[PDB]
Amino acid sequence: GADREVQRILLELLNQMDGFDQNVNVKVIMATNRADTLDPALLRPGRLDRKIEFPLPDRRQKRLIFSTIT
Amino acid sequence: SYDRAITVFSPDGHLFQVEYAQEAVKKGSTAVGVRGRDIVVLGVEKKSVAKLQDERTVRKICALDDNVCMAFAGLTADARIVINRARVECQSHRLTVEDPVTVEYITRYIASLKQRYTQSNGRRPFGISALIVGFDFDGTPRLYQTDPSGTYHAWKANAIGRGAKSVREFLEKNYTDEAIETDDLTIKLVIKALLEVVQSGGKNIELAVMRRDQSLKILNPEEIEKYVAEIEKEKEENE
Amino acid sequence: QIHSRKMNVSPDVNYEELARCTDDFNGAQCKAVCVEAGMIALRRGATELTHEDYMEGILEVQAKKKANLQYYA
Amino acid sequence: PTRVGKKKKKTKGPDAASKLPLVTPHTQCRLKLLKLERIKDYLLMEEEFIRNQEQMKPLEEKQEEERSKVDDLRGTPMSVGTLEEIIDDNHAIVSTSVGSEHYVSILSFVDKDLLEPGCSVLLNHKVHAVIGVLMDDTDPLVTVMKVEKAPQETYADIGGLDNQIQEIKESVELPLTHPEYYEEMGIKPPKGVILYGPPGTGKTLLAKAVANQTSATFLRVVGSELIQKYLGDGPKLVRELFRVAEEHAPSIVFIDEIDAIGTKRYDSNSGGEREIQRTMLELLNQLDGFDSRGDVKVIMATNRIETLDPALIRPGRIDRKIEFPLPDEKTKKRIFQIHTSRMTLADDVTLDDLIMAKDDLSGADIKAICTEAGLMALRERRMKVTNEDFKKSKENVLYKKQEGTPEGLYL
Amino acid sequence: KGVLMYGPPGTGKTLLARACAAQTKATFLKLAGPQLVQMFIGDGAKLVRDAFALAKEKAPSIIFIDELDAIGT
Amino acid sequence: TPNCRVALRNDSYTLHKILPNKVDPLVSLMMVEKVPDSTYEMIGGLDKQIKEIKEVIELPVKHPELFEALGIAQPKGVLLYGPPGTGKTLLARAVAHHTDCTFIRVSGSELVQKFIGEGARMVRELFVMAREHAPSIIFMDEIDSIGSS
Amino acid sequence: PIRALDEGDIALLKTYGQSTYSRQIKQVEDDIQQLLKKINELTGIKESDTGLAPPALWDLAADKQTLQSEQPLQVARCTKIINADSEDPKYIINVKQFAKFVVDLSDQVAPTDIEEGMRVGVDRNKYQIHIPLPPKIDPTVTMMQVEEKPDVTYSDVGGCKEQIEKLREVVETPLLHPERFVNLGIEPPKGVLLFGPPGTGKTLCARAVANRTDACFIRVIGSELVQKYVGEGARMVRELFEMARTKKACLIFFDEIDAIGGARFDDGAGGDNEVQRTMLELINQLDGFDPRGNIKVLMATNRPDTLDPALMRPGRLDRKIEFSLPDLEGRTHIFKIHARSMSVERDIRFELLARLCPNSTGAEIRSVCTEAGMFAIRARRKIATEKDFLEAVNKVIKSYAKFSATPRYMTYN
Amino acid sequence: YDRGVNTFSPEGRLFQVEYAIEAIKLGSTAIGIQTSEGVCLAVEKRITSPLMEPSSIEKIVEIDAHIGCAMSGLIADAKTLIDKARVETQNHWFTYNETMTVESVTQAVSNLALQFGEEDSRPFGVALLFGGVDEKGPQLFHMDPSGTFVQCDARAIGSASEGAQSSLQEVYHKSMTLKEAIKSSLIILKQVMEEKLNATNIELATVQPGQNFHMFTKEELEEVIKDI
Ligand SMILES: Nc1ncnc2c1ncn2[C@@H]1O[C@H](COP(=O)(O)OP(=O)(O)OP(=O)(O)O)[C@@H](O)[C@H]1O
Ligand SMILES: Nc1ncnc2c1ncn2[C@@H]1O[C@H](COP(=O)(O)OP(=O)(O)OP(=O)(O)O)[C@@H](O)[C@H]1O
Ligand SMILES: Nc1ncnc2c1ncn2[C@@H]1O[C@H](COP(=O)(O)OP(=O)(O)OP(=O)(O)O)[C@@H](O)[C@H]1O
Ligand SMILES: [Mg+2]
Ligand SMILES: [Mg+2]
Ligand SMILES: [Mg+2]
């Protein structure tokens, strides 16, 4: 019990994102830790079109964060 | 409900791991066998060939000596070892004692081999059940069977495999007090008993006979087709 | 003996027998042994107790029961 | 006295359907044209006889002075109350719907014998006095659960289950039709019967077939009908349902899927499981109420039996446990005989071949094959059904569940 | 002002505390554990404070608490 | 009438009027009231699946006497399944646009509400609301919820 | 190669096959089911009763001596009293469905008999106490204090005589001989709970000594102590333990105490919604008002989970009497019980039966005796044979119980 | 606790051997009576099928030409103990030119009835009755999987053990004869079995002093049945 309660909150989220109704002009921004864990039904486009990875920095972006703080 | 060791008794006194091996017998192919007046016979239920393989390597009936036969159920891995072992013992007996091997001696060996193999941990018991047929002991036809517990036992007619209970109930209403002489009549008994197969395709039967003096005679699927025709012909006359 | 003051006890009581036979017992169970000994003497209707009645009370507390067990000659 | 209260003065209302179950040609024949037009004749006349009944009654009544004034002596919006206790001095203590309890008078025209604690009465608004006792009427929730129409076909509909059909007929139909046998040995009939097994086997069929051919009042309760949320509505209905079953016939109470109302009795302190559990407990109590059950038979039916409360399963409550297995290769011949009867069967088919190749399909599997093979003939534009439609129906319907076997491992 | 008695079982937990106020007469005040536990919400805490404040109004009174491990968790 | 509500005069409790529209609480997304979202032609590449569903919805409803003449029971249940998400919803919305029939949308997780009871009784109150508009098609979203095991 | 069906192709199916009787048989069946409906709303027979009396005796009653009960008589409610005060009433009273009130008595009474926990007549507006009423004596106790002989013989529960001997010593010996207690110097035990497997003889050993008491006996329904309204079940268990302690030599039998039970001295007791109202009030009145009583109370349940150590603290409950299975001779006695009263053969032996019943209850033993009779009904019989019982034991025990796989036996003979 | 023979209870005990005694209880019944004229012996067959050949079911085996045997419980454990008991009398004759006495047979048998965990396997599942005529007259003995060896005057084991022993103490006395005790035995057998007793349900075995041959009855058994 109550682990299918977590699992059905996914399903209600999947329905009101890609059900019949197609609620236009609403926008969904999600952010996680490690995202290899999660459900592939989220990751299909039409629902979660944009896949953006943040690196740590790299070099030439250490410079830019050094600039903006100092 | 401890069923995870072989050296433990239940609080009502059982060995469930011995009991679970006999359930693996019931997923095996059926085989029956009767003894006759002079000619013994046994038959098997052969499964369907899958159209792209050779069928001389699916052997389910073997001979240990020149005068004793064998039919089994269960799983073919454990069956191959017991066959290969018992061919040695019926040969080594002949060396130590110059007689041919009686049908009763070789079943005590197979049962005792399955016996001592049950007792120690780390020795998963043989999930097969054998039928041993031979008119070998001085013109006397006999048939026995084994059991995964390791208990050899003598019948006069037998059935194993999936749904043997239907066949064993069938034979008690069919095996007459009339000892079926005229040995094609005795073969007609087995082919009619295996005509009450789980499927009874007609072309899926392999019967093996022994006329107590020859070698093993595997029948051919034209002679066996002749006996299936006369069974349906004589059954139509009964109406 | 404090708890057995209020009942008819046979005055043949070996407390050395009662001291060592008790093990892993609190005084709650030791009170219970004395009352259960008196209840068994009521079952047979005897007026008095015995050390065996305390030993029978010991078997009654943790619910033991014996027999002949045919391992033990 | 000897015959105290003469046993609640109460009749029974059985079913009214099974008007004429003799349509026995079962085909396009002039007999069924003649049979049904006879049935049309008797129903039109029974319509026209009662039409003339409310027609030719010149009465034009004038009410009696005593009855007309008492109807105005009572209030016009009468309210329904409940007796709790009685003091015989023309005033007693009753209860409202909310439970407010009032020392109201009772009027001296109420037929002061029907006053028993638990009986329903009528009340006023001003002084809330007992105007008149109401007859033992129930809520609309239980009246839906009383069957009006005999549903479907008789024991010829099912495809061979006769080892178990002869069991239930001994436990239900035989004690009602012929209770001579039991008194010949002084043996009481069994009380409760549980039907269990794999699904799609015919548990609901045998419930419908008994409800077809019976003279009992058949009550239909399905599981989670019986669960509500107003803190007493659960155990109230069980008392009301078996009061109705007591006052009416030697009766049959069919409760279906009691696994949704009984499993092993855990008692978490949260007030969600108690309402289940209090209702669960009182049904088991009202089962063995033993006051006067008056031959009320109870039939219960689930799929799994292992997840049940063992207090239900024990004898004393329920005496019969019946398995409905996946049958055989023999009664399959009868189900294929039945479900292919009303269709133009072509003479190329060997339906034994389908029974031959398979071992564990059910009755609902067979009916799905018979519908699908008929649909395949419509696809290739036919009426008769070849062998090939049954081949394509067997492949299309069956392969959705079959998973897991050690092929090659055995032989 | 807080001294705690503990041991394997009692007969020695209550019994020593029974021995404590038997010969110390300074206004003994016993209190048990689930006697605080009511269906009344908060009247556990109400009875805790009001009995303590009553024992504070008495000048020599000591406070006993019986099976505090019923809520000592 | 069954489940008949009446207008009751609040003073003297007299029957003011028979009220129509027998009880339908929370039937909002049921009978959608606006169909056009996607058409029958814009799917593509799924023609066999379209043909089977039309044979099980449109064929039994438009011509019931064909099955009566043949002597089989008409089917009523369809399970659609596909792992990644491939057209499961469009084909339902196309039938929603092209049926000329009462069409009920139930994303089933909305029958759990909070209470003992209430989450179940509306299922009974659902099919009688579908029986009222007697030609009907009821749709389930995502039975990986209620209906598991 | 799939083809679907055009509109002309529909007409091929719909035409062919009895185009003379197709609709001719069908619309007759169609409109007759319409006619089944049209009879039913045309009939609509249903009529009322409304419980009136014959007008021979109520016409003079229906005179002004109804209005003399309308306008002079009142509509007063009933309540309970928490407590009182001295020299001045200031009474505290709960409707408990409405609020609790601080009220007065009306002038028609004396302040004597307005004691605590009493039903009183309460004004609708000023809420004054009008008439004190009894606690509704006595259907709250005597409807389960039946004081009636039950039909259970002493020879019915034979075979468990030592568990009976425990209960015969605990119950009977103080109630009729509290003299050897003085002759020895002891006092009787005053607490016994029963638990064990269902259908063992729990209610039997209760009802057998309820038959052999010649005295007051009370059986208590476990769900009766569970009530719908909050604060109502405790009020009942008040009234039970008060008016049972009045008369002497009585017995109370609690049964199915699972609903009112649970360990309240231990980890749980996080309940407190009308179950603990019953529970806390009963453990209040179990001690406190019982030093050296006369009325013994017995509990019985199927679940040994719900043991309270506060009950099992001595003073409330003392002894754990549980019931067991019969060895053989108890079983063979029970088979003779359930078969002496039916049409049997005079030559069957029952010791052969109890061999085949290793772990079984008398509920199952009774079920075999009924089932064996059912086999006699299958054929034309009127007396049971040996094999009738032998099929019944196979049908009951060797089918659903803990033994299967009978054909693969061949290891034991 | 139990789950293994290398473990004690807090009270005693096993808890493993106790379960081995339970495995005897589902065997077939068997009665032997010691009498000064000789030891008789009886058993019940419990045949399942008519196709099942009856003489392959052994319950009386011949240990030696003056000692019989009777078993219950597990057949698989029994065939090992029968095999050694024939060898132990045979070695004793080889090195002493004499017959091993009936008591000292079972000493050799019990010496690996108790070896099950005493090496450096499970206990057996079989109880035995040994009857024989040695130099001290006729003897009857009984053992168990716990190796507890004892002498009995008239013993009955297997299923219906307690039901036989209660009835069997009623009729036994010291001055019985052999022909009396045979028909005294099978009266108890038809009381405790379930089928009608005939010539196919039971079999006998008697050993006499002067009749070291023929520990058996072969269809003279039909004559004893009608002498009921
Ligand atoms: N033995 C049978 N003979 C004829 N028809 C059968 C049989 N078994 C099943 N059927 C068909 O299967 C359908 C469903 O059977 P039914 O629902 O009664 O089985 P069930 O065990 O009640 O299944 P569930 O428990 O899932 O409801 C019936 O309408 C019937 O037509
Ligand atoms: N076969 C197809 N033809 C045309 N468009 C498709 C197809 N499959 C998916 N799409 C596109 O994918 C989008 C989402 O389709 P849909 O909502 O059916 O996903 P789904 O199959 O319901 O997924 P899930 O059931 O896993 O949520 C739609 O906008 C649709 O245009
Ligand atoms: N020991 C016994 N001796 C005689 N009859 C018995 C015995 N045990 C059970 N019975 C039979 O079973 C019935 C008694 O069951 P009992 O009243 O003990 O059930 P119970 O303990 O009340 O069950 P539960 O505890 O589940 O309510 C009697 O009708 C009797 O025929
Ligand atoms: Mg069903
Ligand atoms: Mg979707
Ligand atoms: Mg009971």
| Number of Cβ atoms within 10 Å of the Cβ of D251 | 25
Peptide bond into G138 cis (omega under 30): yes
Distance CA H228, CA H219 (A): 15
Please list every residue in chain C followed by a chain break, i.e. its C lies more than 2.5 Å from the next written N: none
| Number of Cβ atoms within 10 Å of the Cβ of H100 | 23
End-to-end alpha-carbon separation of chain B, Å? 55
Peptide bond into H15 cis (omega under 30): yes
Q: Identity (one letter) of the amino acid at E25? A: K
How many angstroms separate the Cα of D152 from the Cα of each of D35, D211, G342?
A: 19, 9, 40
Burial class (CB in 10 A: 0-12, 13-18, 19+), D342: middle
Residues H54, H47 contacting (CB under 8 angstroms): yes
Cβ-defined contact of H163 to G328 (cutoff 8 Å): yes
Q: What is the DSSP string of chain E?
A: -------SSSSSSHHHHHHHHHH--S-EE---STTT--SSSSHHHHHHHHHHHHHHHSSS-EE--S-GGGT--
What per-residue string of b and e applies to F108-138 under the rule 16 or more CB within 10 Å gives b?
bbbbeeeebbebbbbeeebeebbeeeeebbe
Q: Identity (one letter) of the amino acid at D381? A: R
Q: D303 CB less than 6 Å from ligand 1?
A: yes
Which residue in chain C is spatially nearest to G174 when comparing CA positions?
Answer: C42
Which residue in chain B is spatially nearest to D411 when comparing CA positions?
Answer: B28
Distance CA D122, CA D131 (A): 5
Q: What is the DSSP string of G41-95?
A: HHH------TT---HHHHTTTTSSTTHHHHSSS---EE-EEEE--SSS--EEEE-
User: How was this model experimentally determined?
Assistant: cryo-EM
- Taking a contact as any Cβ pair under 8 Å apart, which residues of chain G between 278 and 337 contact chain D? 302-303
Angle at D131 (CA atoms; ends D126, D134), nearest 5 degrees: 130
Distance CA H127, CA H75 (A): 10
Residues H23, H161 contacting (CB under 8 angstroms): no
| Number of Cβ atoms within 10 Å of the Cβ of C48 | 14
Residues B164, B22 contacting (CB under 8 angstroms): no
SS (H, E, C) chain D: CCCHHHHHHCCCCCCCCCCCCCCCCCCCCHHHHHHHHHHHHHHHHHHHHHHHHCCCCCCCCCCCHHHHHHHHHCCCCCEEEEEEECCCCCEEEEECCCCCEEEEEECCCCCCCCCCCCCEEEECCCCCCEEEECCCCCCHHHHHCECCCCCCCCCCCCCCCHHHHHHHHHHHHHHHHCCCCCCCCCCCCCCEEEEECCCCCCHHHHHHHHHHCCCCCEEEEEHHHCCCCCCCHHHHHHHHHHHHHHHCCCEEEEEECHHHCCCCCCCCCCCCHHHHHHHHHHHHHHHCCCCCCCCEEEEEECCCCCCCCHHHHCCCCCCEEEECCCCCCCHHHHHHHHCCCCCCECCCCCHHHHHHHCCCCCHHHHHHHHHHHHHHHHHCCCCCECHHHHHHHHHHHHCCCCCCCCCCCCC
Q: Which of D139, D213, D159, D211 is nearest to D338 (CA)?
A: D159
Burial class (CB in 10 A: 0-12, 13-18, 19+), D299: buried
Helix pair angle (B223-237, B184-193), 10° resolution = 80
How many angstroms separate the Cα of D59 from the Cα of each of D47, D63, F70, G43, H126?
A: 22, 12, 56, 19, 96
Distance CA D109, CA G51 (A): 9
Strands B61-63 and B69-72: antiparallel
Beta bridge partners of H142: H129, H150
Q: Identity (one letter) of the amino acid at D201? A: T
Distance CA G126, CA G103 (A): 8
At a CB cut-off of 8 Å and minimum separation 6, what does B205 contact? B43, B44, B45, B46, B191, B194, B197, B224, B228
Distance CA H217, CA H226 (A): 15
Beta bridge partners of H33: H40, H154
Extract the tokens encoding D226.
Answer: 């019986």
Distance CA H52, CA B159 (A): 12
Residues F119, F112 contacting (CB under 8 angstroms): yes
How many angstroms separate the Cα of G176 from the Cα of each of B189, G213, G215, H105?
A: 80, 10, 11, 64
Cβ-defined contact of G265 to E37 (cutoff 8 Å): no
Residues B127, B75 contacting (CB under 8 angstroms): yes
Residues G70, D73 contacting (CB under 8 angstroms): no
Residues H34, H154 contacting (CB under 8 angstroms): yes
Distance CA G402, CA B13 (A): 12
Distance CA H177, CA H158 (A): 25
Q: Identity (one letter) of the amino acid at H137? A: G
Considering just the CA atoms, what is the radius of gyration of chain D in Å? 28
Our separate counts of H helices and E strands in chain B read: 6, 10
How many angstroms separate the Cα of G175 from the Cα of each of C35, G216, G293?
A: 20, 12, 10
Extract the tokens encoding F98.
Answer: 């092209």
What per-residue string of b and e applies to G16-36 under the rule 16 or more CB within 10 Å gives b?
eeeeeebeebeebeeebeebe
| Number of Cβ atoms within 10 Å of the Cβ of B76 | 17
Task: Say which of G402, G405, G407 has its CB closest to residue B19.
Answer: G405
Residues F72, D370 contacting (CB under 8 angstroms): yes
B135 three-state secondary structure: strand
Strands B206-210 and B40-44: antiparallel
Looking up tokens 């059905």 gives: A8
Do chain A and chain E touch with ≥3 beta carbon pairs under 8 Å? no
Question: Was F102 annotated as part of a binding site?
Answer: no
Query: Any idea of the CA torsion for G268, D224, D198, B21, to the nearest 10 degrees?
Result: 0
Extract the tokens encoding G378.
Answer: 């299958």
Cβ-defined contact of E34 to G264 (cutoff 8 Å): yes
Distance CA H20, CA F36 (A): 78
Distance CA B91, CA F82 (A): 62
Distance CA B145, CA B147 (A): 7
Beta bridge partners of G105: G129
| Number of Cβ atoms within 10 Å of the Cβ of H1 | 10
Backbone dihedral angles phi then psi of residue G329, each to the nearest 5 degrees = -70, -30
Distance CA D411, CA B105 (A): 27
Distance CA F83, CA G83 (A): 71
Cβ-defined contact of H160 to G328 (cutoff 8 Å): no
Distance CA G313, CA G308 (A): 9
Looking up tokens 């155990």 gives: D235
Q: Which residues line ligand 3 (CB under 6 A)?
A: D 311, 316; G 157, 159-160, 198-204, 302, 334, 361-363, 366
Helix pair angle (H161-171, H178-192), 10° resolution = 140
End-to-end alpha-carbon separation of chain E, Å? 21
At a CB cut-off of 8 Å and minimum separation 6, what does F119 contact? F111, F112, F113
**Which residues hold their Cβ within 5 A of ligand 6, which is an ion?**
G 203
Query: Any idea of the CA torsion for H166, H168, H172, H177, to the nearest 10 degrees?
Result: 180
Chain E residues inside the 8 Å CB shell of C61: none
Locate the ligand 1 atom nearest the alpha carbon of residue D157 and give its number: 4
Extract the tokens encoding A41.
Answer: 């039904």
Q: Which of G287, G296, G288, G285 is nearest to G174 (CA)?
A: G296
Helix pair angle (D30-53, G22-43), 10° resolution = 20
Q: Which residues line ligand 2 (CB under 6 A)?
A: A 14, 18, 41, 46; F 43-46, 85-90
Distance CA F91, CA G317 (A): 70
At a CB cut-off of 8 Å and minimum separation 6, what does E63 contact? E29, E31, E51, E52, E55
G200 three-state secondary structure: coil
Chain H residues inside the 8 Å CB shell of G409: 48
Chain C residues inside the 8 Å CB shell of G180: 42, 45
| Number of Cβ atoms within 10 Å of the Cβ of D167 | 16
Q: How many CA atoms lie within 13 A of B229 on its CB side?
A: 6
At a CB cut-off of 8 Å and minimum separation 6, what does B153 contact? B144, B145, B146, B147, G410, H52, H56, H57
Looking up tokens 């109230």 gives: D236
A69 three-state secondary structure: helix
Please list every residue in chain H followed by a chain break, i.e. its C lies more than 2.5 Å from the next written N: 120
Distance CA H88, CA H95 (A): 11
DSSP character for G231?
T
Task: Tell which one of G204, G219, G301 to mutate to probe ligand 3, the residue whose CB is within 8 A of the most ligand atoms.
Answer: G204
State the chains in contact with A (3 or more Cβ–Cβ pairs under 8 Å): F
Extract the tokens encoding B63.
Answer: 């001979």
End-to-end alpha-carbon separation of chain D, Å? 78
G207 three-state secondary structure: helix
Beta bridge partners of D256: D222, D301
Cβ-defined contact of C26 to E15 (cutoff 8 Å): no
Task: Say which of F51, F63, F69 has its CB closest to residue G4.
Answer: F51
At a CB cut-off of 8 Å and minimum separation 6, what does H25 contact? B13, H158, H159, H161
Extract the tokens encoding D315.
Answer: 């004898």
Strands G129-133 and H30-35: unpaired
Distance CA H158, CA G327 (A): 17
G13 three-state secondary structure: helix
Residues B67, B134 contacting (CB under 8 angstroms): yes
How many angstroms separate the Cα of B25 from the Cα of each of B164, D408, H76?
A: 11, 14, 19
| Binding residue ranges of E for ATP | 7-14
Alpha carbon H177 to chain centroid distance? 20
Distance CA B31, CA B197 (A): 10
Backbone dihedral angles phi then psi of residue D355, each to the nearest 5 degrees = -70, -30
Cβ-defined contact of H13 to C69 (cutoff 8 Å): yes
SS (H, E, C) chain H: CCCCCCCCCCCCCCCCHHHHHHHHCCCCCEEEEEECCEEEEEEECCCCCCCECHHHCCCCCEEECCEEEEEEECHHHHHHHHHHHHHHHHHHHHHHCCCCCHHHHHHHHHHHHCCCCCCCCCCCCEEEEEEEEECCEEEEEECCCCCCCEECCEEEECCCHHHHHHHHHHHCCCCCCHHHHHHHHHHHHHHHCCCCCCCCCEEEEEECCCCCCCCCCCCCHHHHHHCC
Distance CA A20, CA A18 (A): 7
End-to-end alpha-carbon separation of chain G, Å? 68
Q: How far is ligand 3, taken at its centre, from the CA of residue G194, in Å?
A: 13
Strands H62-64 and H67-73: antiparallel
Element (H, E) at F90: helix F90-97
Q: D164 CB less than 6 Å from ligand 1?
A: no
Considering just the CA atoms, what is the radius of gyration of chain C in Å? 13
Task: Inform me whether the C-beta atom of residue D330 falls under 8 Å from chain B C-beta atoms.
Answer: no
Query: Listing from the earlier edge strand, what are the strands of the sheet with G100-103?
Result: G80-83, G91-94, G100-103
Strands B140-145 and B130-137: antiparallel
Residues G412, H74 contacting (CB under 8 angstroms): yes
DSSP character for G128?
-
Resolution in Å, one decimal place: 3.3
Strands B61-63 and B40-44: unpaired
Looking up tokens 């086997």 gives: D201
At a CB cut-off of 8 Å and minimum separation 6, what does C37 contact? C49, C53, C54, C56, C57
Distance CA B18, CA H121 (A): 15
Q: Which of G39, G334, G319 is nearest to G163 (CA)?
A: G319
Element (H, E) at B61: strand B61-63
How many angstroms separate the Cα of D119 from the Cα of each of B59, E48, F20, G137?
A: 82, 48, 34, 19
Chain D residues inside the 8 Å CB shell of G131: 103
Task: Inform me whether the C-beta atom of residue C62 falls under 8 Å from chain H C-beta atoms.
Answer: no
B220 three-state secondary structure: coil
At a CB cut-off of 8 Å and minimum separation 6, what does D228 contact? D234, D237, F116, F117, F121
Burial class (CB in 10 A: 0-12, 13-18, 19+), H181: buried
At a CB cut-off of 8 Å and minimum separation 6, what does H158 contact? H24, H25, H27, H28, H29, H30, H72, H73, H127
Our separate counts of H helices and E strands in chain F read: 4, 4
Which runs of consecutive H residues, i.e. helices, occur in G341-381? Answer: 351-355, 362-378
Extract the tokens encoding G37.
Answer: 């409906």
Distance CA H74, CA H55 (A): 18
